[PDB]
Design an enzyme around this catalytic site. Structure first.
Site, PDB file in Angstrom:
ATOM      1  N   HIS B   6       0.801  -1.218   0.000  1.00 15.84           N
ATOM      2  CA  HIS B   6       0.000   0.000   0.000  1.00 15.84           C
ATOM      3  C   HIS B   6       0.842   1.279   0.000  1.00 15.84           C
ATOM      4  O   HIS B   6       1.581   1.564   0.947  1.00 15.84           O
ATOM      5  CB  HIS B   6      -0.962   0.017   1.190  1.00 15.84           C
ATOM      6  CG  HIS B   6      -1.847   1.223   1.217  1.00 15.84           C
ATOM      7  ND1 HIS B   6      -2.566   1.635   0.115  1.00 15.84           N
ATOM      8  CD2 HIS B   6      -2.094   2.131   2.191  1.00 15.84           C
ATOM      9  CE1 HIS B   6      -3.212   2.749   0.409  1.00 15.84           C
ATOM     10  NE2 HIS B   6      -2.943   3.073   1.661  1.00 15.84           N
ATOM     11  N   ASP B  45      -1.805   3.702  -4.838  1.00 18.97           N
ATOM     12  CA  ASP B  45      -2.604   2.910  -3.906  1.00 18.97           C
ATOM     13  C   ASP B  45      -2.122   1.471  -3.766  1.00 18.97           C
ATOM     14  O   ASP B  45      -1.660   1.059  -2.698  1.00 18.97           O
ATOM     15  CB  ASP B  45      -4.074   2.931  -4.349  1.00 18.97           C
ATOM     16  CG  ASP B  45      -5.038   2.568  -3.232  1.00 18.97           C
ATOM     17  OD1 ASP B  45      -6.241   2.873  -3.379  1.00 18.97           O
ATOM     18  OD2 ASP B  45      -4.608   1.975  -2.214  1.00 18.97           O
TER      19      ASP B  45
END
Ligand SMILES: [Ca+2]
Ligand SMILES: [Ca+2]
Ligand SMILES: [Ca+2]
Ligand SMILES: [Ca+2]
Ligand SMILES: [Ca+2]
Ligand SMILES: [Ca+2]
EC number: 2.7.11.-
Lengths: 87, 176, 175, 177, 87, 87, 176, 177, 175, 87, 87, 87
Positions: B6, B45
């Site tokens: 992430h 992301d």
């Protein structure tokens, strides 16, 4: 509200002993400075401290002003002992 | 093997920088600013990484998220479409990790480049830097200079090491 | 003819009315926008009137022409500090970007899917709401909002394209 | 007689600007951005100043901190080394002081530039400007425009004074309603 | 802390679903992951969610770590059932 | 929350008063407006207020909406009086 | 083995670009502008190259000329000293050659990216591009976009190939 | 009725500017630089124009040349692909024409902006400016400032007219020597 | 008090008097320099006077204040087109950069070793001569001339350093 | 001074046959255009030419104006033959 | 086209020498190379020359290719002897 | 090369004349200056010329240096007369 000391640090007050000092001062709302050979710097900051080149056998003065005046000072004194910087 | 991490992998000054931090910290938005400054976006992301060898880790975006950035308020934007090929890159080896940690009156951050914290990614120790997210902080500028400084140190210019060396001399001299 | 609170900046040929409670930083954000090459139309007080069935026009009261009030510095004249390239007499309002202080309770378009709008004399002006949070460079975001807005109108809707590809991905993942 | 002040001295548009504020406000980081915008760094954290005239203060950095910036997270960086000679300057006369104060509901600010705030430094009452540190505020841009506006006013362009003048004509002309 | 579900929604977990899922997970302090065929993502964020491409008949696993771990999974489970996404 | 005043300040609502006037408004959560001949502005800000060129003999209307609207009203009414601006 | 070539090796958008041309054409000056635009200087005037393998050629400057540029009129300047570490790079693999040829009413230059002229450097065929030096030509911008386009084509975006494809359709359609 | 003109249509600062000049002057290359500076490309080489009003011309590129630039040496480049949507625009009304003429000892130029040069396009007499192509001339900067100045004059700021006015007061006041 | 032909631009805090025959492009080059963030003092006609034994000051005649004449465009006002940041009332002249059209016959400092100077009322102003040749972006060069000039005065002389290293290299190469 | 032709090029006038044509026109001082289906372009340049999409069976018109009017035309005619583009 | 010399000058071929050498070679159309211990550079340019670090007792080779090859080497040889650089 | 004129133009040397005047000067290799009350400028350029605000009854001096200085003088003298500027 201040306190004087004599640095005993065999290697003066460099990076390590500097960060610890300013980290201790940075836990109080009061204003705390450090005086050495005339020049005075903000103890909450730090390029400031190191810039002094405080060596062994140096006589420095720590001072504070605010609600926790004595507090900040009492913690800085303890820090001068823990890290064996002087007294 | 291939794991999904992430963060936002951006190519800054030729370096792969993986920007990590809790969702809400502003990773995308910062990255968006970084592409406008001339840097390249690799993945937003979701960053798919795999080990290329004992010392190399490679990141890339899942085809579906290619060239995309999600910005709270605006939604999904395509940087390749809004800024051209110069804004995107297929992939890159990850060289540095800049973690955006929300600043709190307690949390600590190295006020010296001495801090050599690192982070493991598939048995590969990736150098990590932690900067505080505080008001009046332009995160883009800081992450960018982190890459710059990182690159400078590897070229043999370590301001931190030089300063400590001089600090010591000053102290010796001060011993009148 | 009515006065609205906000800052009218012309970004990439588009009129953009920045709105938000006083204190959010509309002027300061606009100041940055003129430095980036965009043009200032009106600060604080924006006098708007309906040009027609599908067009609102904004302009500043003569007295506030070329002016920006920045907390701390005071009043500054962008025409005087940046030249004619920093100001414009007026513009049709095409997009509204509302700066809403960030609170753990509120939500914001994470997909450009948003179809929000604000009425200004019978005319529905598209509206976008971005959160004011630490580490957010508002100028960059408002700017890209105009950019994306313009891109979508040229036939490039990243949101619509993505959703199309996502269904394809799901129809497939179903094996 | 050299005294050491806490803050950051930057040459912006030819003006020596001392950035002050409590440790943690982000003076270094703001200065770092300022050098990238083409301005010059004189001193970071510790600014050694001395008086030159009855109306002039000069600031410079202690040799040991020359060209240096300390940025929370990154550590120490050398702007001369990362940006070249164009990013640094040996010293400068201090012309303006921009104090960063962290914004709070109770505090008030100079919504108008009619302010005549000042600060003493060896008898020399240097002009002072106070800007609030609040979310969504790009401090660099503001400090920079402060210098810009400061320089503009000295060249004879005072937007504040001009506006007040026009506001009065408007008010006068208005009481005929 | 976990709760495995079976995606029922014909529509699958596309934009709308993901928006409501992530939107829920965000209200919590704990971390929240989502796993689908090994792939694990941050349920607070979203491109990550939408990228998995979770279709009807999919078996996903939501997990949380933090003070409110449980509140987070109860809230999420409630959404899965609330929006007829899964179970 | 609405109170109509008659400006009696010989110099109208110029820079100084406009200031003190919006600072008072700023102290409250409720939203506070100011109308003068159709044209109405946000009293928390200011270029707007000053841009109305409110002169002596002017009839202005201050209004607010919020949990503390009627408090905002009073403080404004008090400043109007305090600053010898109007009745 | 290591041969010395005449030109300026600059790192443009991550690519190694060797700018060649007769002395007097402005190689240094152009390069000077390129570093100001954010690109990196590797070697000026004398470029020491060697073969790293069957397809890679590496260039670098002799220690003595490190970070240096000689500009007619100003003399010797140090870009590292005037612009920082971001302006210089130790070395790079040479990916493209942009030759600055003095424009003459005869000399030809491909008005299409189709021209696939190449140049041998130690048995390695390096793609070569030739742009004309004519008044009102900002050489920096052109060399820079040459790198940009080069990089774009390798990412799968060949404007030339796309255009020819469409040109053909147009012609087919035109056959009413 | 659409006629095809030779030149390059660029939207600079909101103004549609048709750059003309003999093939070889460097119109494409100059335009390429202009898009990098933040301006928009409408049509390269072939500009299809048509009349909209008795006082308005619109230009656009033939679908086949959309987003394209041909640069001697590099070949064909796609500015939309290399710079994004910000670099291109579907069309624009033509407001100014900047003709590049290669400089020669015999030719004369508008040392003053009092020029009222014009050029017809379907009855519409579009304003025209002629700048010389000479060594050491950065054509992009000049064309760009031409648009800037053009826009400034229309906003009521005519440096030329102001200067002439001041020159006369000076001359008058001077014949008292 | 004497009038000199040239353009006075303040680059990086330094006064730089650009000289060269009309036609070389002094105004056009200066125009580019103000866009790069430098300041214009005087165009075409530069009124200079000796402030002292070691200082010349230049300024423009009131009538030409803020003005640039550009062949083709005519007269432009940089203060009006770029703001106060583009102009400055005056400055001490520190360096002269002469633009001399390039001819196969002339030569130019290829080593910063040059020690040229020009007298302006008893004061010797350092002078640099750069050639005007195709593919030369004059602005960039004049600008770096100021940059290098300033760098040398700060103690960084690339030329002197190089020569020092070159002798070392030769003393060594002698084996 | 002009000349009409009928393209016979089985693949119309694409890149190759275009460059050659404009390269021939670019050797003369005269102004030379090319007309096709109404639209006219500058023959010395080239995105212009190709943009016409001149296909097989097309009737184009080349024209020139200057000292070498007839020259340019005579060379363009020869070029239409060498490359077998038409006549 | 060539002419090998033996560097005599004690000073070696430093800045001044190189300046006059390159300055000479530049006056010619032909190309002009300089070789010292295998290393070959463009004698028109100069950092290239100065970089070789040619010292006293060095054997260098100058070569030219072009219309004026010979004029170039005669001019250069003349400089070698003229400035007492070599022979 | 030096000739002193007496300006008889009723409107002095303003924009238009200054123009024609410097265009004539520009046509010659020699350098041409113009003096008016100490202050002297380059006649090939122009802001300078116009900046002198030369009025009617003014005494100006035109001078030149070059292979064609005396030709430049004549052309200027002719323009002065031609443009009814002075004698
Ligand atoms: Ca995001
Ligand atoms: Ca404001
Ligand atoms: Ca700091
Ligand atoms: Ca060179
Ligand atoms: Ca072209
Ligand atoms: Ca001029």
């Amino acid at each position: 509200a201040q306190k004087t000391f004599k640095v005993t640090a065999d290697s003066g007050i460099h990076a390590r002993p500097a960060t610890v000092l300013v980290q201790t001062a940075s836990k109080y709302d009061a204003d705390v400075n450090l005086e050495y050979n005339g020049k005075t710097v903000n103890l909450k900051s730090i390029m400031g401290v190191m810039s002094l080149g405080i060596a062994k056998g140096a006589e420095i003065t720590i001072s504070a002003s605010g609600a926790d005046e004595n507090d900040a000072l009492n913690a800085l004194e303890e820090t001068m002992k823990s890290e064996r910087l002087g007294e | 093997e291939r794991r999904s991490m992430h963060g936002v992998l951006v190519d800054i000054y030729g370096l792969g920088v993986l920007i990590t931090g809790d969702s809400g910290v502003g990773k995308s938005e910062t990255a968006l600013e970084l592409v406008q400054r001339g840097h390249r976006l690799i993945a937003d992301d979701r960053v798919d990484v795999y080990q290329q060898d004992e010392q190399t880790i490679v990141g890339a975006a899942p085809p579906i998220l290619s060239h995309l950035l999600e910005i709270r308020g605006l939604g999904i934007i395509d940087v390749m479409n809004l800024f051209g090929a110069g804004a995107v890159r297929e992939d890159t080896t990850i060289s540095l990790i800049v973690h955006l940690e929300n600043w709190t009156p307690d949390k600590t951050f190295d006020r010296l480049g001495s801090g050599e914290q690192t982070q493991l990614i598939f048995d590969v120790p990736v150098p990590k830097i932690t900067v505080p997210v505080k008001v009046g902080r332009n995160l883009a500028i800081i992450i960018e200079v982190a890459a710059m400084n990182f690159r400078a140190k590897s070229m043999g210019y370590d301001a931190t090491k030089t300063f400590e060396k001089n600090l010591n001399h000053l102290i010796e001299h001060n011993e009148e």
